[PDB]
Enzyme design. Structure first.
Site, PDB file in Angstrom:
ATOM      1  N   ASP A   1       1.136   3.419   2.421  1.00  0.00           N
ATOM      2  CA  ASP A   1       1.298   4.039   3.767  1.00  0.00           C
ATOM      3  C   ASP A   1       2.883   4.142   4.261  1.00  0.00           C
ATOM      4  O   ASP A   1       3.228   4.272   5.289  1.00  0.00           O
ATOM      5  CB  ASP A   1       0.422   3.111   4.715  1.00  0.00           C
ATOM      6  CG  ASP A   1       1.006   1.650   4.434  1.00  0.00           C
ATOM      7  OD1 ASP A   1       2.059   1.321   3.810  1.00  0.00           O
ATOM      8  OD2 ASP A   1       0.260   1.052   5.420  1.00  0.00           O
TER       9      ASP A   1
ATOM     10  N   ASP B   1       0.782  -1.178   0.244  1.00  0.00           N
ATOM     11  CA  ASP B   1      -0.073  -0.052   0.210  1.00  0.00           C
ATOM     12  C   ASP B   1       0.966   1.210   0.031  1.00  0.00           C
ATOM     13  O   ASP B   1       2.155   1.243  -0.065  1.00  0.00           O
ATOM     14  CB  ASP B   1      -0.819  -0.143   1.111  1.00  0.00           C
ATOM     15  CG  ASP B   1      -0.384  -0.544   2.491  1.00  0.00           C
ATOM     16  OD1 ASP B   1       0.955  -0.671   2.477  1.00  0.00           O
ATOM     17  OD2 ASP B   1      -1.171  -0.612   3.437  1.00  0.00           O
TER      18      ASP B   1
ATOM     19  N   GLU C   1      -5.618   3.034  -1.793  1.00  0.00           N
ATOM     20  CA  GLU C   1      -4.554   2.457  -1.510  1.00  0.00           C
ATOM     21  C   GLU C   1      -3.686   3.368  -0.430  1.00  0.00           C
ATOM     22  O   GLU C   1      -2.354   3.789  -0.812  1.00  0.00           O
ATOM     23  CB  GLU C   1      -3.621   1.937  -2.449  1.00  0.00           C
ATOM     24  CG  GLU C   1      -2.466   1.005  -1.840  1.00  0.00           C
ATOM     25  CD  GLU C   1      -1.770   0.268  -3.251  1.00  0.00           C
ATOM     26  OE1 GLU C   1      -2.260   0.626  -4.459  1.00  0.00           O
ATOM     27  OE2 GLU C   1      -0.542   0.030  -3.245  1.00  0.00           O
ATOM     28  N   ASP C   2      -4.221   3.725   0.684  1.00  0.00           N
ATOM     29  CA  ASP C   2      -3.540   4.520   1.753  1.00  0.00           C
ATOM     30  C   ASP C   2      -3.149   5.862   1.185  1.00  0.00           C
ATOM     31  O   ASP C   2      -2.193   6.493   1.648  1.00  0.00           O
ATOM     32  CB  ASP C   2      -2.449   3.951   2.567  1.00  0.00           C
ATOM     33  CG  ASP C   2      -2.829   2.879   3.302  1.00  0.00           C
ATOM     34  OD1 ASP C   2      -3.909   2.695   3.779  1.00  0.00           O
ATOM     35  OD2 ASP C   2      -2.164   1.862   3.588  1.00  0.00           O
ATOM     36  N   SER C   3      -3.531   6.547   0.210  1.00  0.00           N
ATOM     37  CA  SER C   3      -3.525   7.788  -0.258  1.00  0.00           C
ATOM     38  C   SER C   3      -4.528   8.710  -0.170  1.00  0.00           C
ATOM     39  O   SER C   3      -5.709   8.332  -0.002  1.00  0.00           O
ATOM     40  CB  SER C   3      -3.332   7.845  -1.878  1.00  0.00           C
ATOM     41  OG  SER C   3      -4.000   6.968  -2.700  1.00  0.00           O
TER      42      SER C   3
END
Ligand SMILES: [Mg+2]
Ligand SMILES: [Zn+2]
Ligand SMILES: [Zn+2]
EC number: 2.7.7.6
Lengths: 1412, 52, 84, 213, 153, 102
Positions: free
Chosen positions: A470, A468, B18-20
RNA sequence: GUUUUCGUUGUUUUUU
């Protein structure tokens, strides 16, 4: 090439020969004598010549050159010296071998206690291995009491008795047993004596003591001179920037050499005995620390600061030492690591590369006639921007620092020069993430030079990485040669890693926004207008500028989601899947039908657009290729970007809430479950709870309450799911499947449910309570971790702490599993690093010993087989007949005349009838072959090559096989074509009969399936293949089959390793990681010894006779059934004075009076289905009548067996304790218990189909496979032992292979995931290809006798090197590890051959290409 | 520790996956979550001998 | 003892993807070294596309020495080893 | 009781011994290969059930097809030990019986145990080859297990062309150890290579070959 | 730094494939200062119907052998075994514990006074050689006194 | 309630290195002799008096882990110690525990 | 003057 000229021809190392180093050769390499410990000659540079830092040994700085070779660090290869030991010493890794060689020969005559005279020694010496022959020499020397001066006829022996050799301190001591036992003269075995006896050893003797005369010597095994390394090896290492602390090696060498000079001084001075001893031992452990400061039982040499001193042994064994940390792992250049970001508008096989990365990283492009213009543009452009040269490499090797070059653009490029062109757009680069389990974690992406300092990627390519944005750091590697770019583009690309060989499925699919969108788009009532239509058409990359006619036209033109889908879809793709048994009119828009890229009905879902097998991505893989899949990804991604950008889809709190009716349904469901829990509490607390099988009363209570409360949470959740509405974005989320699931909604909206930790319930952490707020024995749910709230409501502090329990449980599980899953992966990779299918097609080792003659028994790659249903295998024999058999004479079951132009010829003909007959009995033979041998019970769909279905449909749609036109193609055409093509299938080429036998073996299933599909009857009655249709069908089948062959050179061993490990990287019967580990360590018995005894059919449909068999298998001793034991001393041998046995012995009696008394449990007797009198009889057999038994009367209150002995107190108790356990009453020993177990075994139907049958069986606990197998009423040909080691012990190696495979198969199916057959089949065959069971244990893998370079690099490197050098082994550099730690071409794949510039084709060139 | 900033929930840009997260540039220009970083380098003279 | 006869060649009559990569890289590196050109060029400035075109019509002067496990090898001319 | 279970154990052991012979190309009277429990009891055992190992000891001719196929095959003398604890004297008596009758192959399936001291002489029974087995693993045929495929020794030409075709070495085949259950089933000594016909899930049938090593 | 509180009985279940069954541990150390002085672990030998009687021999601090507990009771002042039970036995209604401590009495029966028990301890007491029986008994008494239950006295 | 149940490090140190709760206080160390006096105030029965027959069901009393007395009427003494810690003569942090069952 | 010169032990905390 780039190196300075050297007349030495360019060659590589082909062999590595091990062994010891002779002191004479030590000087032959010693470039200078070293005797001075003192290093810096005058503390004014120029270190001491002849010292440890002798410049003659080498140079250390930039300008200085090695005095020996003449060059500095640029070319100085390092040079060695010698330091003569004042006295011979021992090598730390040979003292056990010193004992070994001292257990074999004479202490004075120095020769073997025997010769080849005795047969044992001679046959031992016929062994090729040195170590084995020498150890057998030991094993036969220990058969002789003395060092034989004669035959056990003088052998030239000394005759003195062999001393008892012991590793006494650093040295060894030998207890000479000279002329019952003499004075034990164990003494310091001075190395001089050992040198003497070794010199006495004849070359034949050392040869038979396992040594090579020209090579490693027991004489060399004694150290007389030590090697002084080149100063490059232990350079001046900066303790503070410029101030250098002397190297640990230098320190230790100085210590050793000063001790040696002390020893040299021990002679000319007064040395009162023990002083020599102390100085010699001082020098000795100093030398030992040189090899190993980690001598066991000794305070290690330690720095004055307190830290211990290191040794060479340390830096060679470990986790990141020489081999691990510098050879199999080492840093690279042209590599970058940075953040990752999402780029929905970017292509799949590109990564958005920062201008910093694309600039600093560069590729050397050779200046050619075509790139001269652009390369010159790059050079003149500048080194501090893009694109531009920062170094220009001359063809001779000269370089120019463009940035420091004031005439940067003034470098005129010569054809042959190299320009470090900055990394452009579309540059293929290796793409790496940590960790990287599957080979799909290495992917070659095209650099797209675009701003921002992250890695911009497609969403879909992130899913196989399972990563991901993050903050993940991602790795990019830039190729530096044309070979590398070609390799990246053809063997490591993103499109080349779409399909996972593990579950022979794609790795990728549509996720997240795009998935939710495509769910919202395909729906029947989705409507779009001209403007939006035209806009997406311009957005659609696969639009031909031609918009089709909208489905809706009047009173207004409107467009539907299906047409928009088909726009992005390039044509030539058909799919059809009935969903949930939906009809053709699809009111729910379920089902699925795409025609030539146009969706007829059905909404596309993640079951088709994800990574599922047979899916649309699967379809493009197996019909069009990877490029088309990349195109369709971009198509759908960009059109979805548009459509959602314009619509948008979100989530809200009102979405997460359901109406109050379902809330109260949830509440009452939880309350009802709590009431059931309280009922179970009451039953358990009054023992009213009926005992479950294999589930104790309190644990039964806990488990059933667990089941009840899980049912509570699931019922509440299903109610909440039902109350989810159409506009509800929550059910829309799960139906879209972009993320989330049923249990997620259940926990958020309805209730979280019991916090189950490692499959258990939150226990009473305090004293009989889980919290001080709860009470003692608070069996009610709230005090044991069942959540009564949902994530909406919020949780009470107690149950909040319980959810904290569960969350910490999960996190700790993950954190722990990391390390073990890791080392598992590494050892498995080490296990099978060289299995490759050779060009022959056989799977062999580097030795050439064939593991399997063919890949997956069929020589096919894991991307060309697919699940196919063999039509013959199922079906009623009547239905099978009326589907496969023809009937010409009677028109009732004939071919209808409409479809053919030759029905009149067909009607009444016999040649056609006999042809179709022969085909029919051929199909019947195939039916036998499959239904009885290959696929036996219930399944007929298997991964087989060549998609026949799609080929048939393709022919139909190409040649318009609709309508009822009559056939211009005759039946003999089909039959001849099929018979031809059955032979045309080629797998193993060659002319030997075994070649064609293996060909048949490979092609049997494919031929059977084709026959199950392409029989003439089906041809005509269904799809009537015309001339063109049939001919192209045959050609395409042959082409696809020949393209379906395995490519020789694949690293199928590592492929299998990854394909098995990656599944294990995600997670009461032994499955999953536990059973995996039992398999991999090769535990001799698994943790759950359990034998799946299959009772005979008539017993398998029986229970009570099966119960009797079960009791006869359950081992019974009185220990199980003894209720109590109270020993008497009975005053009278023939009677008693105790109420408990008075009448009993009065009735039975009609020697020692001490009494062997015990009581037995009547209920345990009847459960055992035995009686106590037979227990007395059994003791009668086991102990004769020496312990006079009785059985007390069964009507008596106490089942007593008085085994009267015939002061006797202690012995009576001893016998009592012994015979409480050593009286076998009934049952099969080794089987503590058995289980009465169902098996739904499939059996065919008489009419032709199949059906399941409940057959009873015995799950005998413990393992006595042989005994239960010999039990009457047991399927001896089917009964299995879950420990495959027991299978080896019982059945052999082939059956053990099958058993291991099925174990691992069940483990794979345990989580539900799938892994390809052929890889773990390769695994199990390798486990068995050598006839026994091979383990992944450290010694087990190290017990191999290949090049030590692998086993030593695993662990304990030093010991393996000691064994190899002692054997003076040879490494042929054939392992790939040898290649990587020598840096040359590997013998794999691209290196599995030698591509050569030829002459026959070069002659065809025009003469102008002639070299000058 | 932190700021109270305005967030809306949707899938508008497709970059939010996606975590953005997607940011308002106006707030950044006005200085939302602008900050100050400070790095202290310490240096000292040393004594090789007594007077050196 | 070394070369398996071209008719005795019992292995695939098709080029392999590993062989594909090797041949493409070798030919493109050769022409990058100003070696003779076996095909035509339209705009393929990077040598890799030229090598790809060479492989398309299989006009490549290379031969593959597919090593057999026993020790022998099979020599396959590019133009005779079928495209795959 | 003890008697009948011993009888059945012995009978099944003998049945699978004669299966040994049959699978080794030794012809056998099918009436004896069908020597059912009751007829074996009558011919061999007594009324109460006491067996007669010595009378039960028979000699097996090779099939002539095997005779041309496996050339060296002589006769096979099955004899179960007279005294359960095979002593030095008992083992010597049996071995001298083998040598005097010149039994080409003689298999000595003992009853209780074979002490290593009595096993010392077994290599010294030249020129007669002795094979020693136990009743228990012969009670049930090991190779008749469903998952166990059928296995056949490769004759001189068979194994020879097997090695020649692959250009393999004898040390380059899959291994069947000399003490492999089926190797003892198939009387496998040095070099003897066995074809195994394994069920194939991906191709139907699979050929395999293991060298007795 | 969190550490276990001392001066508490810690009985643990020792592994079955070991002569020890249960290890009664106490880190007997001076409460004041909370500093370690010594510790003691009493190990229970034997099994059920296996390993003979349920003998108990513990290794005192700085001794080189597991000395039976009844013997150290003799050495520590109470030589008769009924005193040892009066110190151990506190639910006299139980017979199983009596018959289970019987083997301990049998094995310590070789020791019948404080002198022989103290000499027994001193022999294994890891002391030097030549200390003789007198100083051996004195050192055994001291080590039964000091570093044995130092938190008590 | 004694530690924070959510503050933990990452993998290598996760679960370990634990934090207190919000209202926690640590015993700084008070002389044990006042506690000895408070306990002996209730007619303690010496360990020498502890007998299998006499003290068949009597309460064994421990200080800081050291076993320092017996009693047969423990309810009064435990109530007095509890109320006295409520008062303050006992240091308010001193732990009083009554194992009634054992 | 093209060119052109920093490192380690140990310790802690970390990072999907
Ligand atoms: Mg990451
Ligand atoms: Zn040099
Ligand atoms: Zn000698």
């Amino acid at each position: 090439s780039q190196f300075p000229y050297s007349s030495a021809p360019l060659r590589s190392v082909k062999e590595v020969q091990f062994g010891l180093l002779s002191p004479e050769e030590i000087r032959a390499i010693s470039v200078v004598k070293i005797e001075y410990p003192e290093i810096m000659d005058e503390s004014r540079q120029r270190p001491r010549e002849g010292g440890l830092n002798d410049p003659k040994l080498g140079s250390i700085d930039r300008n200085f050159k090695c005095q020996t070779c003449g060059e500095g660090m640029a070319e100085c290869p390092g040079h060695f010296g010698h330091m003569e030991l004042a006295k011979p010493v021992f090598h730390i890794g040979f003292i056990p071998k010193i004992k070994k060689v001292c257990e074999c020969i004479c202490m004075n005559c120095g020769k073997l206690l025997l010769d080849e005279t005795n047969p044992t020694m001679a046959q031992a010496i016929r062994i090729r291995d040195p170590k084995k022959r020498f150890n057998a020499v030991w094993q036969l020397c220990k058969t002789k009491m003395v060092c034989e001066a004669d035959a056990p006829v003088s052998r030239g022996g000394c005759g003195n008795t062999q001393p008892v050799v012991r590793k006494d301190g650093m040295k060894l001591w030998g207890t000479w047993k000279k002329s019952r036992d003499a004075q034990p003269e164990r003494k310091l075995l001075t190395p001089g004596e050992i040198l003497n006896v070794f010199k006495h050893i004849s070359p034949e003797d050392c040869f038979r003591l396992g040594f090579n005369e020209d090579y490693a010597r027991p004489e060399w095994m004694i150290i007389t001179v030590l090697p002084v390394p080149p100063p490059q090896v232990r350079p001046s290492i900066a303790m503070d920037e410029t101030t250098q602390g002397q190297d640990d090696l230098t320190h230790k060498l100085s210590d050793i050499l000063k001790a040696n000079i002390n020893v040299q001084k021990l002679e000319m001075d007064g040395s009162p005995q023990h002083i020599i001893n102390e100085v010699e031992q001082l020098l000795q452990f100093h030398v030992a620390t040189y090899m190993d400061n980690d001598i066991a039982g000794q305070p290690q040499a330690l720095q004055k600061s307190g830290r211990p001193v290191k040794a060479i042994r340390a830096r060679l064994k470990g986790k990141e030492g020489r081999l691990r940390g510098n050879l199999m792992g080492k840093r690279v250049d042209f590599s970058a690591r940075t953040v990752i970001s999402g780029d929905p508008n970017l292509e799949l096989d590109q990564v958005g590369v920062p201008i910093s990365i694309a600039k600093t990283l560069s590729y050397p492009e050779t200046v050619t006639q075509y790139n001269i213009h652009r390369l010159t543009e790059y050079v003149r452009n500048g080194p501090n921007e893009h694109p531009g040269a920062k170094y220009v490499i001359r063809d001779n090797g000269d370089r120019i620092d463009l940035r420091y070059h004031k005439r940067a653009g003034d470098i005129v490029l010569q054809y042959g020069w190299k320009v470090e062109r900055h990394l452009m757009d579309d540059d293929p680069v290796l793409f790496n993430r940590q960790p990287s389990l599957h080979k799909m974690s290495m992917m070659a992406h095209r650099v797209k030079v675009m701003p921002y300092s992250t890695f911009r990627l497609n969403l879909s390519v992130t899913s196989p990485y399972n990563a991901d944005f993050d903050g993940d750091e991602m790795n990019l590697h830039v190729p530096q040669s044309e070979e590398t770019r070609a390799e990246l583009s053809q063997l490591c690309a993103v499109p080349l890693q779409i399909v996972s060989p593990q579950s022979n499925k794609p790795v990728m699919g549509i996720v997240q926004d795009t998935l939710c969108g495509v769910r919202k788009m395909t729906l029947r009532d989705t409507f779009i207008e001209y403007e939006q239509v035209m806009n997406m058409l311009f957005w659609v990359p696969s639009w031909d500028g031609v918009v089709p006619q909208p489905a809706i036209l009047k009173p207004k033109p409107l467009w539907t989601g299906k047409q928009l889908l088909s726009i992005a879809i390039p044509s030539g793709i058909h799919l059809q899947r009935t969903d949930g048994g939906n009809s053709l009119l699809s009111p729910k828009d379920n089902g699925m039908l795409i025609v030539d890229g146009k969706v007829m009905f059905g909404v596309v879902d993640k079951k088709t657009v994800g990574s599922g097998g047979g899916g649309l991505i699967h379809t493009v893989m197996r019909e069009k290729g990877p490029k088309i899949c990349a195109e369709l990804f971009g198509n759908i991604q960009k059109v979805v970007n548009y459509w959602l950008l314009h619509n948008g889809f979100s989530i809200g709190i009102g979405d997460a809430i359901a109406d109050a009716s379902t809330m109260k349904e949830i509440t009452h469901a939880i309350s009802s479950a709590k009431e059931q829990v309280q009922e179970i509490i009451y039953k358990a607390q009054h023992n009213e709870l009926e005992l479950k099988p294999g589930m104790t009363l309190r644990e039964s209570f806990e488990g059933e309450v667990s089941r009840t409360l899980n049912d509570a949470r699931d019922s509440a959740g299903r109610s909440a799911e039902m109350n989810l509405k159409d506009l509800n974005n929550v059910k829309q989320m799960v139906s879209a499947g972009s993320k989330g699931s049923f249990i997620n909604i259940a926990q958020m909206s309805a209730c979280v449910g019991q916090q189950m930790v490692e499959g258990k319930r939150i226990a009473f952490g305090f004293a009989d309570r889980s919290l001080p707020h709860f009470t003692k024995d608070d069996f009610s749910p709230e005090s044991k971790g069942f959540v009564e709230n949902s994530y909406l409501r919020g949780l009470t502090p107690q149950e909040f702490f319980f959810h904290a329990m569960a969350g910490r449980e999960g996190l700790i599980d993950t954190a722990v599993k990391t390390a073990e899953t890791g080392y598992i992966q590494r050892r498995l990779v080490k296990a099978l690093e060289d299995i490759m299918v050779h060009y022959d097609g056989t799977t062999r080792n580097s030795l050439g010993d064939i593991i399997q003659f063919l890949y997956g028994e069929d020589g096919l790659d894991g991307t060309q087989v697919e699940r196919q249903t063999i039509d013959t295998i199922p079906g009623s024999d009547k239905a099978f007949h009326k589907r496969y058999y023809v009937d010409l004479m009677d028109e009732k079951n004939s071919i209808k005349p409409d479809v053919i132009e030759y029905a009149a010829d067909i009607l009444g003909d016999v040649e056609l009838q006999k042809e179709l007959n022969s085909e029919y009995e051929q199909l019947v033979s195939d039916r036998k072959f499959l239904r009885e041998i290959v696929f036996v019970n219930g399944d007929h769909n298997w991964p087989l090559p060549v998609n026949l279905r799609r080929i048939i449909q393709n022919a139909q749609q190409i040649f318009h096989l609709d309508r009822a036109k009559a056939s211009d193609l005759t039946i003999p055409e089909i039959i001849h074509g099929v018979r031809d093509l059955c032979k045309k299938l080629f797998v193993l080429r060659g002319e030997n009969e075994l070649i064609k036998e293996a060909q048949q073996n490979a092609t049997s299933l494919f031929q059977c399936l084709v026959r199950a599909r392409l029989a003439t009857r089906r041809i005509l009655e269904e799809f009537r293949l015309n001339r063109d249709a049939f001919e192209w069908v045959l050609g395409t089948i042959e082409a696809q089959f020949q393209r379906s062959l395995v490519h020789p050179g694949e690293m199928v061993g590592v492929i299998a390793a990854q394909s098995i490990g990656e599944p294990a990287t995600q997670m009461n019967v032994t499955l999953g990681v536990p059973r995996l580990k039992e398999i991999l360590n090769v535990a001799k018995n698994i943790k759950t010894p359990a034998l799946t005894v299959y009772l005979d059919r008539e017993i398998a449909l029986d229970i009570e006779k099966a119960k009797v068999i079960q009791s006869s298998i359950e081992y019974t001793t009185l220990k199980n059934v003894t209720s109590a034991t109270e020993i008497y001393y009975d005053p009278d041998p023939t009677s008693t004075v105790i109420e408990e046995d008075f009448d009993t012995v009065e009735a039975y009696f009609s020697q020692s009076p001490w009494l062997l008394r015990l009581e037995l449990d009547r209920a345990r007797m009847l459960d055992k289905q035995l009686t106590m009198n037979q227990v007395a009889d059994k003791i009668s057999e086991v102990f004769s009548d020496d312990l006079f038994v009785m059985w007390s009367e069964d009507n008596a209150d106490k089942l007593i067996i008085r085994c009267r002995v015939i002061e006797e107190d202690q012995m009576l108790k001893r016998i009592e304790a012994h015979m409480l356990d050593l009286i076998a009453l009934r049952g099969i020993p080794g089987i503590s218990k058995v289980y009465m177990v169902k098996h739904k075994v499939s059996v065919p139907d008489e009419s032709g189909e199949y059906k399941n049958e409940e057959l009873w069986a015995l799950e005998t606990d413990g393992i006595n496979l042989a005994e239960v197998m010999a039990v009457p009423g047991v399927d001896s040909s089917r009964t299995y032992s879950n420990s495959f080691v027991e299978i080896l012990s019982v059945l052999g190696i082939e059956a053990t292979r099958s058993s291991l495979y099925k174990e691992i198969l069940n483990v794979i199916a345990f989580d539900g995931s799938y892994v390809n057959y052929r890889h773990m089949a390769l695994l199990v065959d390798v486990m068995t290809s050598r006839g026994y069971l091979m383990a992944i244990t450290r010694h087990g893998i190290n017990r191999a006798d290949t090049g030590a370079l692998m086993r030593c690099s695993f662990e304990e490197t030093v010991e393996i090197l000691f064994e190899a050098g002692a054997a003076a082994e040879l490494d042929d550099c054939r392992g790939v590890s040898e290649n990587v730690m020598l840096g040359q071409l590997a013998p794999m794949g691209t290196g599995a051959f030698d591509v050569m510039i030829d002459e026959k084709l070069l002659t065809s060139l025009p003469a102008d290409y002639a070299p000058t | 520790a932190g700021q109270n900033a305005i967030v809306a929930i949707a899938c508008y840009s497709g970059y939010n996956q996606e975590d953005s997260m997607i940011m308002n540039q106006s707030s950044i220009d006005r200085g939302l979550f602008r900050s100050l970083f400070f790095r202290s380098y310490m240096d000292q003279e040393k004594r090789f001998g007594i007077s050196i | 003892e070394l070369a398996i006869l071209k008719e005795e060649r019992t292995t695939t009559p098709y080029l392999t993807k590993y062989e594909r990569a090797r041949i493409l890289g070798t030919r493109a590196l050769q022409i990058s070294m100003n070696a003779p050109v076996l095909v035509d060029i339209e705009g393929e400035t990077d040598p890799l596309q030229i090598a790809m075109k060479e492989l398309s019509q299989r006009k490549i002067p290379l031969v593959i020495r597919r090593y057999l496990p026993d020790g022998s090898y099979e020599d396959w001319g590019c133009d005779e080893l079928i495209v795959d | 009781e003890d008697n009948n279970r011993i009888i059945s154990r012995l009978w099944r052991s003998f049945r699978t011994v004669k299966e040994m012979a049959a699978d080794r190309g030794y012809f056998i009277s099918q009436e004896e290969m069908d020597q059912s429990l009751e007829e074996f009891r009558s011919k061999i055992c007594d009324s109460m059930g006491n067996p007669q190992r010595k009378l039960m000891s028979f000699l097996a001719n090779p099939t002539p097809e095997a005779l041309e196929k496996y050339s060296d095959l002589g006769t096979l003398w099955v004899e179960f030990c007279d005294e359960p604890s095979v002593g030095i004297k008992t083992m010597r008596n049996f071995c001298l019986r083998i040598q005097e009758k010149n039994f080409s192959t003689g298999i000595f399936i003992y009853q209780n145990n074979i002490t290593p001291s009595a096993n010392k002489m077994i290599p010294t029974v030249s020129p007669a080859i002795i094979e020693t087995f136990q009743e228990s693993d012969l009670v049930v045929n090991i190779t008749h297990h469903e998952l166990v495929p059928k296995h056949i020794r490769l004759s001189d030409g068979e194994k020879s062309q097997l090695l020649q075709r692959y250009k393999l070495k004898e040390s380059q085949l899959p291994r069947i150890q000399r003490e492999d259950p089926v190797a003892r089933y198939l009387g496998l000594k040095r070099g003897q290579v066995v074809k195994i016909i394994r069920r194939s899930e991906t191709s139907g049938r699979y050929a395999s070959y293991r060298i007795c090593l | 730094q969190e550490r276990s509180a001392a001066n508490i009985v810690q009985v643990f279940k020792k592994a079955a494939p070991s002569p020890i069954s249960h290890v009664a541990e106490i880190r007997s150390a001076l409460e004041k200062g909370s500093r370690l002085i010594s510790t003691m672990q009493i190990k229970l030998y034997g099994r059920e119907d296996k390993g003979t009687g349920r003998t108990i021999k513990a290794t005192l601090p700085y001794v080189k052998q597991d000395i039976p507990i009844v013997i150290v009771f003799r050495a520590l002042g109470v030589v008769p075994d009924g005193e040892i039970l009066q110190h151990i036995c506190y639910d006299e209604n139980d017979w199983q514990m009596l018959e289970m401590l019987k083997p301990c009495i049998e094995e310590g029966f070789v020791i019948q006074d404080k002198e022989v028990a103290l000499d027994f301890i001193g022999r294994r007491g890891s002391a030097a050689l030549g200390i003789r029986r007198e100083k051996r008994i004195q050192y055994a008494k001291d080590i039964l006194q000091k570093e044995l239950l130092p938190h008590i006295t | 309630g004694l530690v924070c149940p959510a503050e933990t490090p990452e993998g290598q140190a996760c679960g370990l290195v634990k934090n207190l709760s919000l209202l926690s206080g640590i015993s700084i160390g008070s002389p044990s002799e006042p506690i000895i006096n408070f306990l002996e105030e209730w007619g303690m029965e010496p360990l020498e008096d502890y007998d299998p027959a006499q003290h068949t069901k009597s309460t064994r009393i421990f200080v800081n882990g050291v076993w320092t007395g017996i009693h047969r009427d423990p309810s009064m003494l435990v109530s007095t110690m509890r109320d006295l810690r409520r008062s303050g003569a006992i240091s308010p942090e001193v732990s009083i525990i009554r194992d009634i069952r054992e």
